[PDB]
Amino acid sequence: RYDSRTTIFSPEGRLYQVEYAMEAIGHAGTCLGILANDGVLLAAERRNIHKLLDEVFFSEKIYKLNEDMACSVAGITSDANVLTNELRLIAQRYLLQYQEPIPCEQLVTALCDIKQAYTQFGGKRPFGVSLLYIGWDKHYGFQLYQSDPSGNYGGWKATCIGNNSAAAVSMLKQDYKEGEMTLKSALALAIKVLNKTMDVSKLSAEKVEIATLTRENGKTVIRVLKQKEVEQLIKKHEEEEAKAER
Amino acid sequence: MFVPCGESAPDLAGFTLLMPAVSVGNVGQLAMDLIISTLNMSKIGYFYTDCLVPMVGNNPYATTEGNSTELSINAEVYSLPSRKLVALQLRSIFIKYKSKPFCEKLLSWVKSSGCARVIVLSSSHSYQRNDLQLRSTPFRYLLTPSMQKSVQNKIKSLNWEEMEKSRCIPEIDDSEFCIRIPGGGITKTLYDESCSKEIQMAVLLKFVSEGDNIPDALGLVEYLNEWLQILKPLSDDPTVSASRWKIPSSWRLLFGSGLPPALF
Amino acid sequence: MSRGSSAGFDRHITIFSPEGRLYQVEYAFKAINQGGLTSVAVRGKDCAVIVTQKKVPDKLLDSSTVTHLFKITENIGCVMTGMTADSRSQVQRARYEAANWKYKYGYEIPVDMLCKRIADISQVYTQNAEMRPLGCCMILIGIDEEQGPQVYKCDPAGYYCGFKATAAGVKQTESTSFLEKKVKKKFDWTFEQTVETAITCLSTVLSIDFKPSEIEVGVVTVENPKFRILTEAEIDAHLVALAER
Amino acid sequence: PVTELSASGPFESHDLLRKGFSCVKNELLPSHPLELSEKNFQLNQDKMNFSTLRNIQGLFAPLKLQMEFKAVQQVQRLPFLSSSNLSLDVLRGNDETIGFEDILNDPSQSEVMGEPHLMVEYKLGLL
Amino acid sequence: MFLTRSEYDRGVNTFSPEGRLFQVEYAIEAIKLGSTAIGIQTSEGVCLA
Amino acid sequence: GTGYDLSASTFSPDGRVFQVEYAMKAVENSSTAIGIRCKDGVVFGVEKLVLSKLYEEGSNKRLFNVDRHVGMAVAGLLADARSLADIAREEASNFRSNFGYNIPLKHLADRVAMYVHAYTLYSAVRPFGCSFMLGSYSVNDGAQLYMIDPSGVSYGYWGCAIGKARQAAKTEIEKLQMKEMTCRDIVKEVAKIIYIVHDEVKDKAFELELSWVGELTNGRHEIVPKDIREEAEKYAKESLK
Amino acid sequence: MAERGYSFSLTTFSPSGKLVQIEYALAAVAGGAPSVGIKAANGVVLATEKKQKSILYDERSVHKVEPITKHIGLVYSGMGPDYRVLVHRARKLAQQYYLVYQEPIPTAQLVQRVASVMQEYTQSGGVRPFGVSLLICGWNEGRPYLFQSDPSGAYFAWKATAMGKNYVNGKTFLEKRYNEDLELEDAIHTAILTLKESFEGQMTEDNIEVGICNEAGFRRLTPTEVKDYLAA
Amino acid sequence: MFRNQYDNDVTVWSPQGRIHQIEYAMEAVKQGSATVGLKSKTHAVLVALKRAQSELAAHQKKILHVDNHIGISIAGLTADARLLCNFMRQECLDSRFVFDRPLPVSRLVSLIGSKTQIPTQRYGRRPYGVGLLIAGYDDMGPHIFQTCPSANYFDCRAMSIGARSQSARTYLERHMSEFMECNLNELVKHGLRALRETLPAEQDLTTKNVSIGIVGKDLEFTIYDDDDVSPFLEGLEER
Amino acid sequence: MAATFFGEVVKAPCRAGTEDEEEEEEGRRETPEDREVRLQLARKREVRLLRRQTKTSLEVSLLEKYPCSKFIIAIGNNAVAFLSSFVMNSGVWEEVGCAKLWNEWCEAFCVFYHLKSNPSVFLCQCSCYVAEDQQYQWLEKVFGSCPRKNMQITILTCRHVTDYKTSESTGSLPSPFLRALKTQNFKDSACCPLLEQPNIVHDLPAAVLSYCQVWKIPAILYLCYTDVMKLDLITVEAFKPILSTRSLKGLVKNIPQSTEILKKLMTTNEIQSNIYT
Amino acid sequence: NHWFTYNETMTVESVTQAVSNLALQFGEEDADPGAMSRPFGVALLFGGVDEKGPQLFHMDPSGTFVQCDARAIGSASEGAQSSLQEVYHKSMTLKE
């Protein structure tokens, strides 16, 4: 009736501990994913922005899982480390058995089965991690999935997780054009949204990391944009907002 | 409501009402037994309400065979007009959704009957004591804003510790502060309603757990006796302590009944 | 008792308090004082001495069975302070772990490695919800090979450390101050001077002039590395030699 | 010739798709002399240690070791994810030795792992 | 003295101070939510309705 | 120590495990057993309480034979005492099987006491609510008397009393110069002490349960023979008045 | 302070998503003895304050600055036994990496594996988090590394940091005095000064511990070397 | 009142040094129906009162057969009685298999004592809520044993357990001086009169509510029920 | 609550009922989804006096529409059986209402009879188990708010001997035994020892005795402390001393036929379940 | 299983006893995992014909069975049992 365990339903059928697990992400940094006609992207807010923090691994939030997929976590960081390790393992196990790269939804489904197992057996805290997956496979092409602590995934054409995900989702839903998106327009929309939802500070190409996925000559190219390109995108947005004002 | 024993109200003109709360360990109720027994107070009425599970038994303060057969119900009022003291003793547990109605009925009686002060003897959960409260004294107090009739200075001179104000709703960094006596039962309801009604209430409590809670009751009556002097002040005697609160005869077989044979 | 964790900041071993303190471990440290006995261990130039109170409050009790000095290996002895059964069980565990070390590594366990092993086990007790710390303190002595005398003190939290002199029990703080004052002056006590130091610490912080039957003394020496427990005649000789001076 | 066909009662049921390829014909004579010696090595080492503790010290010693082992192995990770056995190694004494189980055929990267719920409820004895 | 809450029925394996296990009698109450079944044993057979 | 006393794995704010203390009080729940060690043996005696006249004499015995040379006198819960008798018998038999000779009494006491302690450690089991005494005799070891209590603490005694009236019986044992007495005079004095501390009104109609191991039994634990027990009971009665 | 039992369980989120038993384990770290890590241009410095501060301690016995391999070293602030159990595990993990790949483990790989162990301990129930936050200093690929792993199992790469008591003031001090081009010697001076900030009286070479990591590998400074650094 | 924290589990010692779930299990024994056991020099008989809701049901099976020389009468929870009876039967089979001889009654009862002592110390268990009256015959003669939920067992000259069994025990204490030289017929009559003493003054023993089980020097354990008890009940003088 | 998994944090029982928080953090924004549920649950568990051939809406308290001079309440199986066998075996008794109430443990509700020869005499026959939050409603539906002090209430009930608090064992006491508890206006002495001082009674019998104490009505409560709380012949016979008391003076005509009625009513015997023997 | 092993039909009481052995194994969960952990909330009425003619058995949430001659189980078992009390006589035809 109450909310002390994951293995207890309230008398209206609510699993309150899972709902609290899902409440931990709303604190975490804003991760944004946008699907285009020629690629996918992940725009993530650099939450750890202290002065004495070191220049780190190629990305704080963006993780490579295959040759073909990348993820972008939001939530508890240690749970996220465990989960990305297991994602990479699952993908290499599929490749070992079938000699083909794992399709994107099968990887998402496997991880979400793991997360649901932690929301079902008692005496195990669920994973306070909401992931955001981008990939390519020969079945459905460019794909973008989302996952939440309950092991509950879904495929999107543009979604956001983390802090201010609702304002970002409203803005995407207003501005995302289905079918007429290219990767440059998706990057413009990503900067615009990730600007209006990071209103604790002014957007600069040191609090955002952007990774794009494309296909070039029969190979997938997961590429994390360099700091000198995100600045050019931010300038393009600022000049656009100046023009649209007056 | 208050029902007298003799078709006449006893005129509690400026009396101090001592009452328990049905709190963790029954420490408030056990302390009230100690006070009523030691002061040798005489029953003056009943507090008949819908709010406490009904119970009945003969005189819990029997001393002679004459008065050992006096029936008692779950809520009974005792008095000592020499010291202008009136005492309530709740001997039961509250019925679901009925604690608040009892609190408004009781406080309406306090305002109508003319009682000056109210003193609530209570307790709280000691498993919820934080870092500091573990290394402090078990006893805490609360005074409603009206209760200032030169007793704020007295309590200050006694070097007592006020009940710590927790934040009304957690998870908010602003943390608006209001009292929270977890396991005090009606203690918080009584405090809030006294503050609303402008009644001089004091709450004295101890952080206790459950089990043999007779040491806790004796400690709480010694706290109250530091304040009120309802008894000769503590370590002033040739250690005639342990003989200075009269244990009621009903405090017998407190762990149940006798040991069955063929075990041990 | 069956199972579960008691709710409260000081009522289960695996609960932190708001200040990040494990209070059940500190309550185990208070359990060390359950017994009312103090132990002194003093390290010298070529010897280590453990000295403990021997209270036998019973005419009917066979006094040769009351002892807190134990032999872990042939060359390591310890004085246990705290709850008596917990002390004897931790001695049994130390004995087993020392035998395993000799089995695995082909040479006899050092003192630091034995206290490290016992403290690793104690840490495991503090982290899990089924077990509890032992309310006891182990002070180990031995002669190593090339370091010299060793006095080590494991404790209920899983902490261990080597010392030049240490105390456990009721008068641990008073004895520690006494030994600090003694060690600041000079430290190369021969063998007699270490025994006099340990006995004087115990008999000063307790303000008790000792009898050979109110005190236990176990020693190791560089020339005689084997743990030895002095007979009452030897302790009485030390006490009369201390009194005459 | 193993006898033992519980065949009095060979009524047991198996999951055909999950049993894989089982050949009880050859499951009576290990494939190598070292197969079982290595499969059950921590088991046999625990049994040897409990036996020496029993014979030298008494019932209490193996009981306390088994009780500690049972306790630490129970605040663990659900079977479809690899655990560290940090406390169990500290208890068993493997916190400072590396064997061949530690470096060969790493359990942390299994190359094959089952379904989460199937592996959890197999550990629970439910099949 | 006082009336206090005593609960011996919220878990199996707990006898009440009366020698009585309440979680089994609550299962018999669970029977009383079923539908009525009548069985009569005669010498010509047994009927189940 | 309320709040810290529902588990044998909880420490009171002053380092006291209270379930173990309550188990020792559980031992104080039962009638008294005394054991006296003399110059040439050990003598046990139990103030055994007659539960009914319907029980066959000898039932509910509290003086076990743990080995050929060891005898055990118990108090506390009798089911716990029987389980610990089984454990002690297992320990003695296992030692003899491994090492080929009778287990020393000190070693047996250590093994059983460490079992009792192991129960004082976990939330999964409760401490034994039973205390007992072991007593042996060997030509190469002398008489030996040990008492283990529910906390797992075993010491060696010259005279012990466990049970309800352990304090009065201990006062009465201290008057005996047991270090220079034989088993016969000790049997008479054990009967006397059992009769003295018996509470004739609260408890009712007890029966003596005397046992020795000594050189008069050649290091073999036995029940005191019927005639010597009769003499001891007659001495004990005549001394009471 | 018992928020409806959200405070006492490790496996219960609070209604706001917090896990207020892993942040109580972070209050054990912030109540430990101060630690400092400074990643200079050619090395890392690990300075801590010793709790064994009296004359009666053998100082060849137990240390707070430990080596993992030749090139990795730890310091902690928090609960010492948890540190020791994690140190032996980190040493085992480093040797397993060597045995498999025939190369010394990188600092980041070691930090990841240790952090996974800590994370495991923050998710089961019936167990307790670790009361230590580690600083790992390493030297790989001609490049210093300074990491920090906290009781939750979430590690951070730092240029400079401070743990233990008075670490917010320590970090503020470090911000004003750290520059990337710092050499290892000036880093040792700055680390000793940052310790001297929050320190309980006179600071001797015998009540602080320093360990450096440069090209030559991780090394714990002897009391004479610390004495010399303190004299300047 | 101060008892509530210490009586919900069999692993909690009350600060008076009492396990209370053990005593509550003993009450569970008192909630059965009276059964009597008594022995002579040659026979050991078990007499039990059956309840059948007073109509339309075959009565409880209160006397059970454990071996050719051991039989038990139960009072208390039926599930526990069946668990313990399965244990007793398996132990008797094991004795016959390994040693070819009938398991001694005292050894069987000791095994029951250990088996039923384990639940009274362990977590997640409850004591056995059944008390037994074991009637045996071995090399040492007839035997009557009483086992309890507390895991105690008693060697009885005669014993009654169950609901309102104090009256039967008063009768047996009054008349036990003549049980030994009684033959089978009047020994079973003595047991029948005790069991009748456990009844209201109006109710009387009939074939429908009396079960008898004899073991003895020549007999194997036989149970007499519902019409076989008539030879024993015919000669029983009125109350 | 009791540790569903390993190391689950468990809170101890509270005998003062303060683990319910008394519905703390009241939530003045109670959803109508919640209020409908609360009111529906309150309606399900309501007490309701209803008259025969009227079947609903008695609308007034039962003792204030009919005059009364004697009122015998029997509570539980054994008290009801005793009262029926030994009192309704006489002249005609007329039913004047039941008290329908729903409960988890509720089981014939009190039917109220008033003697035709003497309309002032009344009987409540509860096998009805009235829960705590129904006892005061029962009191107001039966007695009301005009407590005329001419009545002589006589409550009869049974309790298990293990509820007796005694220094001996509650297995050595000679069950069943009768204990009394009378109010202050009950001038006559009891036919049984008065219940002791640490012993209390807490239920509908306590509700009626408390009502009669507060409002100064004579009342006697007879407690049978029995070792068999099912329908038992010895337990029912334990109440017989009461028959020689002024309240039950003219109502007991034929005792010899009452034993036969009692034996028959025992042969009815609501079926026991197989938990035992 | 009985037919396989012994080549004959299991009697009504033996089937009821086997079902009871399964049904009385609650509590004691950490002893044989896959056990039930609470009483079964079902009462059964085994009615069969065997070597001893027609037989009717009753099992309730206890794992315990008793042979009967007329049982009612369910929500109106008290009223239906009181009715079976008189309408039943030990020699009545199956049609009645």
Short mmCIF file of N, CA and C in Angstrom, two decimals, chain H residues 53-61 78-79 82-83 86 89 122-126 128 208, chain J residues 13 17 20-21 24 28-31 62-70 81 84-85 88:
data_model
loop_
_atom_site.label_atom_id
_atom_site.label_comp_id
_atom_site.label_asym_id
_atom_site.label_seq_id
_atom_site.Cartn_x
_atom_site.Cartn_y
_atom_site.Cartn_z
N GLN H 53 -17.41 -33.02 14.65
CA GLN H 53 -18.45 -31.99 14.58
C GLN H 53 -19.80 -32.52 15.06
N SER H 54 -19.79 -33.66 15.74
CA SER H 54 -20.95 -34.28 16.38
C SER H 54 -21.94 -34.91 15.41
N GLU H 55 -21.75 -34.75 14.10
CA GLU H 55 -22.57 -35.47 13.13
C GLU H 55 -22.07 -35.21 11.71
N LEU H 56 -22.29 -36.20 10.84
CA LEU H 56 -22.07 -36.20 9.39
C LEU H 56 -20.62 -36.26 8.97
N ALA H 57 -19.70 -36.64 9.84
CA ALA H 57 -18.31 -36.74 9.46
C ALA H 57 -17.69 -37.94 10.15
N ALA H 58 -16.85 -38.67 9.42
CA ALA H 58 -15.97 -39.61 10.08
C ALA H 58 -15.05 -38.82 11.01
N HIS H 59 -14.86 -39.35 12.21
CA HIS H 59 -14.13 -38.63 13.23
C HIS H 59 -12.66 -38.46 12.83
N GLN H 60 -11.96 -37.64 13.59
CA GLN H 60 -10.53 -37.49 13.38
C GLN H 60 -9.83 -38.83 13.56
N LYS H 61 -8.72 -39.01 12.85
CA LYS H 61 -7.86 -40.18 13.05
C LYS H 61 -6.83 -39.75 14.08
N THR H 78 -2.83 -30.70 13.33
CA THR H 78 -2.80 -31.96 12.59
C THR H 78 -1.65 -32.01 11.60
N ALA H 79 -1.32 -30.88 10.97
CA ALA H 79 -0.22 -30.87 10.02
C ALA H 79 1.08 -31.24 10.70
N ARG H 82 1.17 -34.99 11.43
CA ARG H 82 1.51 -35.76 10.24
C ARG H 82 2.98 -35.65 9.89
N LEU H 83 3.56 -34.46 10.01
CA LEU H 83 5.00 -34.31 9.77
C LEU H 83 5.81 -35.17 10.72
N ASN H 86 5.36 -38.93 9.89
CA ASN H 86 6.21 -39.31 8.77
C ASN H 86 7.65 -39.48 9.22
N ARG H 89 7.89 -42.79 11.25
CA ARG H 89 7.81 -43.95 10.38
C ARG H 89 9.09 -44.14 9.59
N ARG H 122 15.58 -21.33 15.76
CA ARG H 122 15.92 -20.88 14.43
C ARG H 122 14.99 -19.76 13.99
N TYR H 123 15.42 -18.96 13.01
CA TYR H 123 14.53 -17.93 12.49
C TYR H 123 13.60 -18.56 11.46
N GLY H 124 12.51 -17.87 11.16
CA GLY H 124 11.66 -18.32 10.08
C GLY H 124 10.99 -19.64 10.31
N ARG H 125 10.88 -20.08 11.55
CA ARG H 125 10.21 -21.31 11.92
C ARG H 125 9.28 -21.03 13.08
N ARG H 126 8.45 -22.01 13.39
CA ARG H 126 7.64 -22.01 14.59
C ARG H 126 7.74 -23.38 15.25
N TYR H 128 6.64 -26.95 16.91
CA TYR H 128 5.60 -27.89 16.53
C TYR H 128 4.44 -27.77 17.49
N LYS H 208 -18.73 -44.44 18.83
CA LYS H 208 -18.50 -43.44 17.81
C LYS H 208 -17.42 -42.44 18.18
N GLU J 13 -8.84 -42.14 -0.54
CA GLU J 13 -8.13 -41.64 0.63
C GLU J 13 -6.65 -41.44 0.33
N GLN J 17 -4.61 -38.05 0.65
CA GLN J 17 -3.41 -37.96 1.47
C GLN J 17 -2.23 -37.37 0.71
N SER J 20 -2.79 -33.74 0.45
CA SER J 20 -2.57 -33.13 1.76
C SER J 20 -1.08 -32.99 2.06
N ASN J 21 -0.28 -33.98 1.69
CA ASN J 21 1.16 -33.83 1.84
C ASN J 21 1.67 -32.62 1.09
N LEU J 24 0.07 -29.15 3.09
CA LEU J 24 0.44 -28.76 4.44
C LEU J 24 1.85 -28.21 4.53
N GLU J 28 8.04 -22.19 6.46
CA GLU J 28 9.28 -22.93 6.22
C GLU J 28 9.81 -22.75 4.80
N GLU J 29 9.72 -21.52 4.28
CA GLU J 29 9.99 -21.24 2.87
C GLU J 29 11.45 -21.48 2.50
N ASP J 30 12.38 -21.08 3.36
CA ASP J 30 13.80 -21.25 3.09
C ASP J 30 14.27 -22.64 3.53
N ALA J 31 13.56 -23.66 3.09
CA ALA J 31 13.93 -25.05 3.32
C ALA J 31 13.85 -25.89 2.07
N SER J 62 -5.41 -26.33 5.35
CA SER J 62 -4.55 -26.85 6.39
C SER J 62 -3.71 -27.99 5.88
N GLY J 63 -4.00 -28.51 4.70
CA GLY J 63 -3.41 -29.75 4.24
C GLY J 63 -3.89 -30.91 5.08
N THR J 64 -5.15 -30.91 5.47
CA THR J 64 -5.66 -31.95 6.34
C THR J 64 -7.03 -32.36 5.87
N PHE J 65 -7.25 -33.66 5.78
CA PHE J 65 -8.45 -34.23 5.21
C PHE J 65 -9.17 -35.07 6.24
N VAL J 66 -10.49 -35.08 6.15
CA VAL J 66 -11.34 -35.94 6.96
C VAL J 66 -12.40 -36.53 6.06
N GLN J 67 -12.71 -37.80 6.26
CA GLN J 67 -13.79 -38.40 5.50
C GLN J 67 -15.13 -37.91 6.01
N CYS J 68 -16.09 -37.79 5.10
CA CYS J 68 -17.38 -37.19 5.42
C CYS J 68 -18.49 -38.00 4.79
N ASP J 69 -19.73 -37.61 5.10
CA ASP J 69 -20.91 -38.16 4.46
C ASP J 69 -21.78 -37.11 3.80
N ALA J 70 -21.68 -35.85 4.22
CA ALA J 70 -22.35 -34.76 3.53
C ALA J 70 -21.61 -33.49 3.92
N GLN J 81 -24.86 -26.72 5.35
CA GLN J 81 -24.53 -27.81 6.26
C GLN J 81 -25.65 -28.05 7.26
N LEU J 84 -28.15 -30.05 5.22
CA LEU J 84 -27.70 -31.43 5.09
C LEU J 84 -27.80 -32.17 6.40
N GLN J 85 -27.81 -31.45 7.52
CA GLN J 85 -27.89 -32.09 8.82
C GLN J 85 -29.17 -32.92 8.94
N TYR J 88 -30.20 -35.48 5.34
CA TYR J 88 -29.35 -36.64 5.08
C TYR J 88 -29.67 -37.76 6.05
#
